[PDB]
Design a protein around this ligand. Structure first.
Ligand code: SF4
Ligand code: SF4
Lengths: 432, 427, 432, 427
């Protein structure tokens, strides 16, 4: 079952819904997220992200004043939308509520209808509206909620049933898919002769990706609204990561495209089933390449089974990554001795773990110490916890400011999986 | 001044951020952020300071307000129990609670909750009221000074100098450094100079500082404003309340370092200190000038564009100025009067209206003057990099390094590393 | 220029010619290397390899007796060929001379004509004969010499000029290409619509690659003699790594296929020119994929330039890797302050380094210390040197028994290159 | 016996390999390999021993014979200068020169070159003449003992026991362990038992051993052959030359450990030692048996195929034998008479002719008996793994761990880790 407690959060595991919802919009092409809140909220989110991807990130501010006690911010939200529209002219804009602006209710839809009246500004510049108070949920749920909003704001409706034509496969990506996960997911699909429409697509937006001296609004983007429009028709939609069920539901009601969803793409079973669902969707067989990698992974399991069989691990990660790493490890005989999550989140039954905690890194250190973690999986914030146990760190997750390569690592698939076994094997071996 | 125009040069961060930049490098203390995660979470990995001991300021602390807690009232309950948790778990010398937009709005009484907590639990709890929406970082820096009124107040007297005891020097010269943040451990370059002159620093205001150091600040003999003018308000309130004189200087560059030390000498007045301070500067200028000549050919005559972003950036100018690089600076309408008045002196009685334009103005403005590097602070790093232009962070926060005499030794190294890098032609 | 000295070798950098020539045969499919020497020579080479690839390796012994003072080994060489042939029935056999057997001259060709008379054994089982005394050259030259032999023993001749038909591109691979280098080289080719004939192909032989309970003779092999035969005809031959010039010459005289050779595939230039030569050979353009990766690499250079610009490095590697790593690093402003090589080897002019040493790890430690290495690139044997300086290690090269992932790393191309920058950047950063 | 059939069970390694396995774990010494790189290079990373101090045996040393050197004669020049290098650079206590096929063939006079080097330079140089082609590893093991005749010979007398001085015990019982290689540091598990009983080990023959320890070996009161019968020749030559009695035992398993200690007790004869040894065994059996019960369910009744490969493998059998696992052993025509005579006792007066067949015989022979794990040593590891069968290395060299009473504690852990691994069903 899931345990919680109170009352002071010590070295928090958790980041805001309203940031996680911001990198979803960040995976649309030529887009611009806008926090409806005071400026520090964004100036913090911005730092967080640039230090991660080590590349610029567009993010603006409603700029709520001390007078956010008086006029809700009607004026602020509106002038923000008009300003950006006329200044960089987005393909899409993200309208996100903070803890501050939500403290009223903050007339979201309305301020947007207050910026759906005046409007010498074209219009035809879509706007995604999301409700994401710092004070509830978390990064991952935040993210999954701006995918619900993205789906619903962009094209789902009119067409249906008869909108299911090509061989285009929709992929609903969750938050803890890196560009390198997303590339695997797309190349994997394309290799079956399908064609992926990734929703959304951080592969497009976040690496070193441009040739202009200046790129203002993310132009190096993922999803074109243009092409998102066409998600209506498409053979099937694949759902990657349970955090996205509510978005697979929104996506699925408005079109008729049938989902085949689930796990983080880690381990034999996880990728086996990914490839199968793909072979089925397209009739043709699993390419010789992934036939080989499965064999390579199996061998990596034979060679690392000595070191990982019965390893105590402690994981401090979003629910998806937790379940994804738990599965992977359990295919090796590894015990996850301590799992700490940021917030309740679905993935009830807990998965097969007797229990998991919501309570962040202070909790991790002590839970880890309790059952004798040999190894801790987590983000850059975990170094300190790890270093304060006498124990190795393998970072994953979404603050990693201390690692050059990290924002981009492909965790997924057969090689991804096998490389993760190499890494735990190597950490465990040298600290012994 | 400052006001804010929605999505236009609208980045800078709250007063909370500003307060936390100023109070966090008090290492042994507990620094509780009273908000929802927007506030804490991120600003926690943090930046800058280096400690020579306690690392408590490195532990993210925060009352993690769920929505229920803001269906008002619980907000206070939590904080009270949050201090009780900090105090029992970690036993800090003291505890600092930072206020935040949500809790300021719903009317949260930080002050009174803090005072209750002091008394029930016995650990001084200092309330910093500077929720983000009050204004900018600077404002939060100032609010950080104000709160150190209810703690600087000699709540405690200067320790007795250690039985070590430097002979023939008036080892009995106490001083403060206000605004030095020992970032990248840079202050470790200056402190030995001070020690040599027999100047005891009662407190480096937020630079490897401890709580018990701040207590004793009123007995300083000469206060010194280190770049930061955001905190002129403490130098002045200490001056007016305890009579303690002050000056402004920086520890960036041979000139300022020498000058900062010089007017230490003449403010607290001694002919032995004075003669020795010339001797020191004598020695060091000799040393540093000598170690810098070989490098003069390599950097000499390179053009640097300079941009101010809240970064105490006229200091670095003093540095590279002397070395011989032509400097072109600029502020952005949302600049202090400081910047613009200095931008003025440096060059041209006209532009400091570079507008709120990001790289747009900035990038093309680099191109205009055929600048070799752009220097501005982490915000403008990626506009410089991606605009295929060399860059050099204006942070002492970082892992270089740049102050006192020996600072410049790696400032120069850092300039060459980037502007001589073969990667530049390769993009 | 190249420096040398004498007289006691302390922690040798070098491994035997006769081992390197053994993994080249090891990259033929269904093959079996045979050392002509006493048994320890093979029992040592075996251990070396299995600890590296961590997978089994076939290797047999002429089994020279104390009576290798009397009958050269005529009898021994012959009974060994008949034994294997009749026991596992190779697609190819490698006949390799050791220090011991060479001490006479050892009637190589002859013992093979002594096993080209008797022969109730089919024949038609090819045999590659190589001269590789432990006492000259080194691992890499060892290797490049069994490629000359492989080329010359298999099909080169009869046909010519008019044997240059398809769109099949030959690749002469050197010793320090890993399976992950070879896969990039092969996939890279195939993406242009060409079809690679890798000579030889460790990709096929060395990972976890099989489905029988037992694989006797490497069946999980690289080059089929079958398909090596067809190297005669083919548009062009690409030569990867200068160690192979003498084999590019052998290959090029016997057929007419024109070579376009050279560098380890590291850095911008190195991969730019690899792709160009490919665009030219096939007319069609550089796929959008590698257009992107070049943009990704350039960004990894901007992000890692801070840490790598002006780094002192010290490299202890085979000449190819040296020049390959030197180039990559120089594109960053990194100085290689100490280069230590196992043996003279071509790559004269030294490349652009003022000098390089032959004299192994004890030399490296002192050369490194001399110029203030910040970082040392080398094999598992270098840990101790590195740990005895105060300095980080990034292993590469051909003994790495202490690293689970390593035998398989792809160093090459845009991602390979960029991932190497991430690694140095990260080691440099944390040891500072 | 042994003879060798080309490409048939033809793997085992030279007598040089064998000599190096026996003499290398003398840590402070310089171990120069006189050959071309075939010999040194690879065997250098090496395997096994753990030292509690000097790491010189970890440094690869070798005279790196180029072809010119074997256009005869230079071979000797080099070696002489090679010792001069080892002695000046590393100042070892002593230096060991190992002979190799190429140099034995061209007639290289190791002995004389060694003696010359001793005298000129003043560091004892010991010549180990066991080039590969003489025979097997065992042979090289025996040639390693012989050479320790010109060095064991009390070239030095036993140190005076340290002023520490365990009271009421006859702390004055000196012994040797011949063939214990402290592999994976496993001997650190036995030594404390010996120390408790007041048995001083003059030398653990090649197990955390130092040169000056070997010198003093003739004054031992009781020698003990630890598994290794390849070196029966030293136990006997010591017995015949200094009168020192001996026995054979292993430190694998509760039985052997208890028995090895027991016949220490009755060989060097004391009623106080004897009463105390029962006490010790009393305590330890109690301890270990108790710590093993919880594991008995998990491993009990599992079938192990056992293969001998020069590995002292009947020792491990003693272990898992008592725990309750059914054991099936087999030797390969090229086995010692030791193996076959023991394979005999264990099971069946017939097969030990499993032929020279690799996995062919081996794999199918595992399948035949429905074995759960195969145990044999690193050579046969990959035939086990890839034949999708659980495996457990017969090396004390490794990082486990298996001797004395506390050794079994991780033998059991190591068995479960592999034969309960879910990875097995997944392939
Ligand atoms: S702007 Fe307000 S709510 Fe946001 S980080 Fe600052 S204090 Fe917290
Ligand atoms: S002794 Fe003989 S078989 Fe053994 S490694 Fe040396 S040359 Fe080779």
């Amino acid at each position: 079952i899931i345990n919680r407690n109170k009352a002071l959060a010590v070295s928090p595991l958790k980041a805001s819904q309203t940031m996680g919802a911001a990198l979803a919009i960040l995976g649309l092409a030529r887009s611009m997220p806008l926090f409806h809140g005071s400026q520090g909220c964004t100036a913090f989110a911005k730092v967080f992200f640039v230090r991660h991807f080590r590349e610029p990130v567009p993010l603006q501010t409603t700029a709520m004043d001390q007078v956010s006690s008086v006029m809700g911010a009607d004026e602020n939200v509106v002038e923000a939308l008009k300003t950006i529209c006329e200044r960089q002219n987005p393909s899409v804009i993200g309208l996100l509520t903070t803890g501050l602006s939500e403290t009223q209710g903050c007339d979201l839809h309305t301020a947007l209808h207050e910026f759906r009246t005046q409007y010498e500004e074209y219009k035809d510049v879509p706007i995604v509206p999301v409700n994401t108070p710092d004070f509830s949920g978390c990064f991952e749920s935040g993210f999954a909620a701006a995918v619900k909003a993205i789906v619903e704001t962009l094209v789902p409706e009119r067409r249906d049933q008869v909108g299911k034509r090509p061989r285009q496969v929709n992929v609903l990506c969750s938050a803890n898919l890196t560009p390198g996960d997303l590339e695997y997911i797309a190349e994997s699909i394309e290799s079956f002769g399908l064609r992926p429409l990734l929703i959304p697509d951080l592969s497009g937006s976040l690496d070193g990706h441009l040739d202009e001296n200046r790129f203002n609004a993310l132009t190096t983007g993922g999803l074109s609204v243009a092409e998102l429009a066409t998600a209506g028709q498409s053979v099937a939609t694949l759902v990657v990561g349970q955090s996205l069920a509510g978005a697979a539901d929104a996506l699925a009601e408005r079109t008729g495209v049938p989902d085949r969803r689930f796990g983080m793409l880690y381990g034999l079973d996880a990728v086996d089933a990914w490839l199968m669902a793909l072979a089925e969707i397209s009739g043709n067989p699993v390419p010789d390449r992934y036939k080989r990698q499965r064999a390579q992974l199996q061998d990596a399991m034979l060679d690392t089974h000595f070191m990982l069989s019965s390893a105590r691990t402690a994981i401090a990660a979003d629910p998806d990554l937790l379940l994804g790493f738990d599965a992977l490890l359990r295919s090796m005989g590894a015990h996850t001795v301590a799992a700490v999550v940021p917030a309740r989140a679905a993935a009830l039954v807990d998965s097969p773990l007797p229990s998991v905690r919501v309570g962040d890194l202070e909790d991790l250190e002590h839970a880890a110490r309790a059952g004798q973690a040999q190894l801790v999986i987590g983000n850059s914030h975990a170094l300190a916890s790890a270093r304060r146990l006498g124990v190795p760190l393998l970072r994953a997750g979404f603050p990693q400011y201390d690692l050059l390569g990290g924002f981009q690592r492909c965790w997924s698939g057969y090689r991804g999986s096998s490389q993760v076994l190499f890494d735990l094997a190597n950490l465990l071996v040298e600290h012994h | 001044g400052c006001a804010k125009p929605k999505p236009g040069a609208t980045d800078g961060g709250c007063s909370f951020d500003g307060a936390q930049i100023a109070l966090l490098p008090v290492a042994d203390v507990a620094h509780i952020v009273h908000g929802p995660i927007a506030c804490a979470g991120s600003s926690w990995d943090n930046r800058g300071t280096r400690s020579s001991g306690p690392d408590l300021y490195r532990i993210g602390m925060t009352t993690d307000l769920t929505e229920n807690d803001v269906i008002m009232g619980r907000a206070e309950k939590r904080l009270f129990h949050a201090i009780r948790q900090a105090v029992e778990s970690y036993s800090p010398p003291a505890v600092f609670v930072y206020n935040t937009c949500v809790p300021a709005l719903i009317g949260d009484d930080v002050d009174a909750v803090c005072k209750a907590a002091a008394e029930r639990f016995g650990t001084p709890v200092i309330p910093v009221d500077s929720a983000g929406f009050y204004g900018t970082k600077n404002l939060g820096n100032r609010i950080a000074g104000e709160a150190m009124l209810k703690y600087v107040i000699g709540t405690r007297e200067p320790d007795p100098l250690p039985v070590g005891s430097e002979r023939p020097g008036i080892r009995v010269h106490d001083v403060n450094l206000i605004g030095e943040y020992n970032i990248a451990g840079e202050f470790w370059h200056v402190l030995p100079l001070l020690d040599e002159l027999g100047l005891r620093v009662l407190c480096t205001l937020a630079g490897d500082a401890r709580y018990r150091e701040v207590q004793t600040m009123h007995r300083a003999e000469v206060n010194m404003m280190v770049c930061s003018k955001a905190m002129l308000n403490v130098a002045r309130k200490l001056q007016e309340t305890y009579g303690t004189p002050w000056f402004e200087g920086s520890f960036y560059g041979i000139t300022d370092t020498s000058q900062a030390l010089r007017d230490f000498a003449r403010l607290l007045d001694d002919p032995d200190l004075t003669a020795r301070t010339e001797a020191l500067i004598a020695r060091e200028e000799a040393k540093v000038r000598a170690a810098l000549e070989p490098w003069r050919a390599r950097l000499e005559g390179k053009r640097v564009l300079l941009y101010t972003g809240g970064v105490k950036s006229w200091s670095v100018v003093s540095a590279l100025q002397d070395l011989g690089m032509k400097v072109v600076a600029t502020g952005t309408k949302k600049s202090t009067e400081e910047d613009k008045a200095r931008i003025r002196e440096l060059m041209g009685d006209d532009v400091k209206m570079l507008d709120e334009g990001n790289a747009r103005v900035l990038l093309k403005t680099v191109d205009e003057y055929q600048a070799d590097i752009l220097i501005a602070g982490g915000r403008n790093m990626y506009t410089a990099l991606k605009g295929r232009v060399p860059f050099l962070d204006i942070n002492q926060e970082r892992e270089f390094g740049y102050a006192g005499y020996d600072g410049m030794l790696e400032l120069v190294r850092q300039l060459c590393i980037t502007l001589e890098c073969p990667v530049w032609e390769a993009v």
